[PDB]
Design a protein around this ligand. Structure first.
Ligand code: HEM
Ligand code: HEM
Ligand code: HEM
Ligand code: HEM
Lengths: 145, 141, 141, 145
């Protein structure tokens, strides 16, 4: 599972990640690049354009909540399946979000970190963060199986 | 499908990249092999050491194909026609792998040009890379 | 991207189906709802009782669109243009759902006409059903 | 997670399934409908055409083997994850087969059952079998996640 060098690559980047800023960019990019995801957040407001989405207060506020949850995964790396048990019920039983969408949000997070950290986001660092988003994605889909 | 603004965004990306394309192709391949180790099975005899002549060489070829696809954005299928035969008929590449390489290319663009890859340019480049993957998997029968 | 052999197979399938298209569309929808209950969320107010007029009626409309796409198999994107706007722009249907409906339609064909759905015909119909899904998800602007 | 209603629909169908014929048909359709899967079975021989694939002795023999393992899932519905643990390590660690391919074979199996059983393959019967092939796919993908 997790090597010590994977733990250090994830922990080091996370120590420099502003949860509010990167969370906002994460969710905005998801709704903009994959527009069908907008159906799930229809009550957020005006999502008719990229700028409207990017500056929508609810999008910014929710993205912050999403990345705070990624922070909980960073703190409990060895028990991600247990940490995301309640959120698995919400997304599977109550929201009906297809699991492929969890993966697309993971991919987007990786792209945001890459844009924010540049050359410090090495291939090895990417490898570590892509593994994390996938473990988190499978933890959220757990109550479909 | 690619809109007029999407075509405009892709053209802006590759104009900015310019002559760096080849080296970016090499980095995308490197990131692919490291982050998705199952992809190495298609390249069993490659020297995979960082910055090997094989990775750099093949990376140049991948990027040049992407440049051609961009320059012929209204006829991607005709530009990458022969490459569709190699990937689909000859190599039998699992279609999911094209999604992975496309994503790695986006990562590489993000690393080098963060101010270029706005949310809207990201969307266009995503649509473009997925169109390339579609063309290269067009004919399996 | 369909070959002349594929187009021949699909036109053979919908010739065999003929006027039964409507009833099969209804069965495909019923199978979708039962097999993949998450799809119900797109039809929150539908009478879902077996053989309801809403399911029968919507099934007919779905089958109609597939029939139209078949006798315009050389230009599927133009024949379904209006429905692409409804599904992608208005309803925001998750792309994965089109794969599910397509699968259910193949199931319905297999149930009623096992002798028609040879492995070869199976392949052509799959590519046709996937081409239809691609058209209806073409414009996420 | 099974109701005895689902257990009955699975058991009743399976008791009529010729593992040799339905297995051969299953794998043949996979290689014909989704031709990139042929890469994994290149050593099987002549796979140039649909006629060549269908009559290939190695295809028929392996298809039979694929369905007999599905037969082990029919016997151990409550313990599917444990049954497919070793095959999971083979497919993931030795063969590097992408999980989506497990879903495709499941869908094909459903279509073969539909063709063989006609009117008896009811929507409710389909729902049970799709659930089973998805649980089998999830159990085979265990070593990845
Ligand atoms: C990367 C994996 C994801 C994580 C870690 C995550 C995290 C969260 C969190 C923390 C909440 C708030 C729960 C609460 O306040 O009680 C939430 C709610 C929600 N999630 Fe996600 N999310 C993820 C992916 C997705 C995706 C891809 C979608 C669909 C596009 C989605 C749809 C929703 C919706 C619609 C809500 C609102 C529920 C409410 O009414 O509060 N989630 N998620
Ligand atoms: C962005 C999409 C892709 C593009 C534009 C692309 C382009 C190319 C090009 C230009 C070549 C060289 C052909 C020649 O030498 O004439 C090639 C070969 C090859 N490609 Fe790709 N490719 C793509 C995706 C993939 C993927 C996803 C894989 C699987 C991981 C793959 C596997 C291969 C292999 C094994 C070769 C032959 C290399 C050798 O001779 O050892 N390609 N491709
Ligand atoms: C084979 C692919 C599909 C075809 C050919 C198709 C065709 C159609 C047609 C003909 C209509 C009726 C438009 C009218 O009122 O004239 C429609 C509407 C609709 N479709 Fe689809 N469709 C497909 C896939 C899907 C999928 C996968 C979903 C989601 C599970 C979906 C959800 C809907 C909804 C919610 C409506 C509007 C129903 C209403 O408000 O009464 N469709 N589609
Ligand atoms: C439905 C899920 C699947 C099940 C239950 C299954 C079952 C099996 C079984 C029982 C074996 C024999 C292992 C042995 O004799 O030691 C096997 C081997 C194998 N499987 Fe699968 N399989 C599944 C999906 C797939 C898929 C989708 C592929 C390809 C995309 C695949 C590729 C292979 C290959 C290449 C072998 C070895 C064949 C050889 O002897 O050369 N499997 N599998």
């Amino acid at each position: 599972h997790w090597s010590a060098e994977e733990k250090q690559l994830i922990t080091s980047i996370w120590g420099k990640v502003n949860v509010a800023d990167c969370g906002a960019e994460a969710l905005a990019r998801l709704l903009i690049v994959y527009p069908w995801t907008q159906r799930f957040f229809s009550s957020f407001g005006n999502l008719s354009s990229a700028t409207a989405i990017s500056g929508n207060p609810n999008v910014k506020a929710h993205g912050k909540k999403v990345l705070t949850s990624f922070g909980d995964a960073v703190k409990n790396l060895d028990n991600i399946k247990g940490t995301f048990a309640q959120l698995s019920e919400l997304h599977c039983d109550k929201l009906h979000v297809d699991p492929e969408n969890f993966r697309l949000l993971g991919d987007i997070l990786v792209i945001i970190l890459a844009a924010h950290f540049g050359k410090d986001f090495t291939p090895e660092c990417q490898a570590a963060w892509q593994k994390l988003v996938r473990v988190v994605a499978h933890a959220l889909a757990r109550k479909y199986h | 499908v690619l809109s007029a603004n999407d075509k405009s965004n892709v053209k802006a990306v590759f104009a900015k990249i310019g002559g760096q394309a080849g080296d970016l192709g090499g980095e995308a391949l490197e990131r692919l092999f490291i982050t998705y180790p199952q992809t190495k099975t298609y390249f069993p005899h490659f020297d995979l050491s960082h910055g090997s002549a094989q990775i750099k060489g093949h990376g140049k070829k991948v990027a040049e194909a992407l440049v051609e696809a961009a320059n012929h954005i209204d006829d991607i299928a005709g530009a990458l026609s022969k490459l569709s035969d190699l990937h689909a008929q000859k190599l039998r590449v699992d279609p999911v792998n094209f999604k992975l390489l496309g994503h790695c290319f986006l990562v590489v663009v993000a690393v080098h040009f963060p101010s270029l890859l706005t949310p809207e340019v990201h969307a266009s480049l995503d649509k473009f890379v997925l169109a390339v993957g579609t063309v290269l998997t067009a004919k399996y029968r």
